[PDB]
Amino acid sequence: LTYTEVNQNLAARENASWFSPVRFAYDWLEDAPIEHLTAVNENSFSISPQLTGLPWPTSFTKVRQNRHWRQSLRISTQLLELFAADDTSAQAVRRNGVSLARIASHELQTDEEDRFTKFATYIFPEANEERMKLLAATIVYIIIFDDSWEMHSEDTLGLVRDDFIRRLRGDEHQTPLQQLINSTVQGFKDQDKTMGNGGQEVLDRLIDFCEHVPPQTKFATMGDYLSYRLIDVAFPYLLACIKFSLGSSVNVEDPKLAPILRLVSDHVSLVNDLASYDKEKRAYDNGSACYLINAVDVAQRLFSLPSAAEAKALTYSMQLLVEAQIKTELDSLVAGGILSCEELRFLDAALLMASGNVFYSVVSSRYGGKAAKLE
């Protein structure tokens, strides 16, 4: 498992210019009993994790990487900077006392190409250069305004959050941070005038993300947990971003697409909880995080397994069943002849999000830490 060979076999030789080097190889199933489980062009290009020795704990085989990821880091560093310097953002603190200025500074400490924005390179791979710039900016909004619904409207964070909401809707002295926020909003409106109506939807779901209070923590079933996790992972926002990355006008809420899209949401939740369990279990065992809220844990309780390792295996199992269901449901939709080109394009990009969520979670620093570094 060598840095040189992974980054050799990942993308075609032709695309090495735009290629984004891979620096980690995290196996979140390393100590999980899974011998019974088997998993067998303008704006993006194919990534081929099968052809490396990268851990590839999924049966999806189409992964893609955005070409313009380098040009996309600017507006999101701009927002991270302006948030780190804004005076109100320093007084706008979460329930845990941490301020918005502090959140932006902590993410500015990470290297530019390995921040939480790198997600977009693999889950929104079809965005052109200008559309990718705005999506990377909204990922900063997701980072900053996470858990901002907890605060009262009259707390400092509540005012920054509700001010942010009003700019996203369309409604004196404008701070430089608000100025940039106004521009991103204008940017999405500009793209809608060009093509598609997904830009305003991305803002609308960001509003919904800042207001929707999550559903508690009694999970009598895994369906109950995954209904909470669809909200928690900001899944409606993610679909808006997929639609916007395509310049699409597809109705994401069409009941014909509801079953395959709830499956995709289940996949993204399961993968992300599998990837993040170790981190979230350490953050609970040393006290850093208050609770442990994770599908692996819910499965360990509900199916009464001895340890997290068995739980990870059962959870991975159910993830592989979700994938089989997705392929069956997509094949059925294609066979019934009830999908336009635009809807098929949207669903294919939904799947690119699902496979790209796996890839980013294997090759990022975020979940495997420093142990999974390649040499």
Side-chain angles (χ1 to χ4, degrees), residues 348-369:
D348 274 343
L351 297 213
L352 290 174
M353 166 177 71
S355 69
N357 182 52
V358 175
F359 187 83
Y360 180 68
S361 296
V362 168
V363 305
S364 158
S365 67
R366 190 163 322 276
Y367 307 111

Side-chain angles (χ1 to χ4, degrees), residues 102-340:
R102 199 140 103 92
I103 296 309
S105 266
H106 186 27
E107 263 273 325
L108 266 164
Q109 283 157 30
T110 317
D111 301 321
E112 195 182 25
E113 297 176 11
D114 323 316
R115 296 172 185 155
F116 210 68
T117 37
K118 197 57 157 336
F119 253 123
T121 305
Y122 301 110
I123 68 162
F124 308 134
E126 307 286 285
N128 62 33
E129 190 170 326
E130 281 302 298
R131 288 180 191 265
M132 179 57 81
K133 280 177 166 112
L134 303 160
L135 294 171
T138 64
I139 291 177
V140 169
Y141 298 155
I142 287 289
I143 294 154
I144 293 295
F145 289 111
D146 202 19
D147 292 322
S148 71
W149 51 82
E150 284 170 329
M151 313 309 300
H152 194 278
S153 35
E154 295 297 342
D155 297 335
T156 298
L157 176 42
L159 299 144
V160 176
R161 167 200 77 203
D162 294 352
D163 174 86
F164 171 74
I165 286 172
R166 283 186 312 268
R167 299 183 191 284
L168 259 61
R169 250 172 220 149
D171 75 327
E172 66 288 327
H173 168 55
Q174 313 268 260
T175 76
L177 168 76
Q178 287 141 24
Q179 293 180 44
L180 190 47
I181 295 173
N182 292 339
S183 311
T184 60
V185 173
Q186 200 46 42
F188 281 96
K189 296 185 169 207
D190 293 341
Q191 299 292 329
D192 284 354
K193 276 297 284 253
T194 302
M195 194 179 49
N197 68 342
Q200 188 55 48
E201 310 194 349
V202 162
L203 310 176
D204 294 344
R205 301 296 82 76
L206 272 182
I207 297 170
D208 286 358
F209 169 83
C210 286
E211 283 162 339
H212 198 321
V213 200
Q216 66 126 349
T217 302
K218 154 259 294 165
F219 305 122
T221 74
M222 192 82 40
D224 283 354
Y225 176 77
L226 293 173
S227 286
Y228 151 94
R229 192 82 172 102
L230 168 153
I231 293 321
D232 185 72
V233 86
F235 192 72
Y237 154 82
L238 294 171
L239 289 179
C241 293
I242 292 160
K243 166 171 161 169
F244 179 81
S245 76
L246 302 164
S248 170
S249 290
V250 163
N251 175 19
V252 152
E253 287 119 11
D254 192 316
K256 155 180 58 154
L257 312 179
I260 194 171
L261 290 178
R262 171 62 194 243
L263 288 172
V264 165
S265 187
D266 291 343
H267 193 269
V268 163
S269 293
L270 288 171
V271 167
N272 186 255
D273 275 351
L274 274 164
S276 63
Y277 177 87
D278 283 345
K279 182 153 91 145
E280 287 168 11
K281 170 77 163 117
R282 275 190 295 270
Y284 173 84
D285 275 3
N286 65 40
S288 153
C290 203
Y291 312 156
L292 168 65
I293 304 146
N294 188 289
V296 181
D297 176 272
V298 173
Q300 204 185 339
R301 161 168 62 88
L302 287 177
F303 291 71
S304 314
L305 308 173
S307 64
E310 281 92 349
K312 281 206 194 199
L314 187 82
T315 293
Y316 183 51
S317 195
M318 96 150 294
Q319 176 209 316
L320 288 183
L321 181 50
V322 168
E323 302 183 351
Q325 292 173 254
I326 284 161
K327 294 168 177 177
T328 289
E329 172 67 22
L330 180 71
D331 289 338
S332 160
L333 291 163
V334 166
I338 61 173
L339 288 179
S340 46

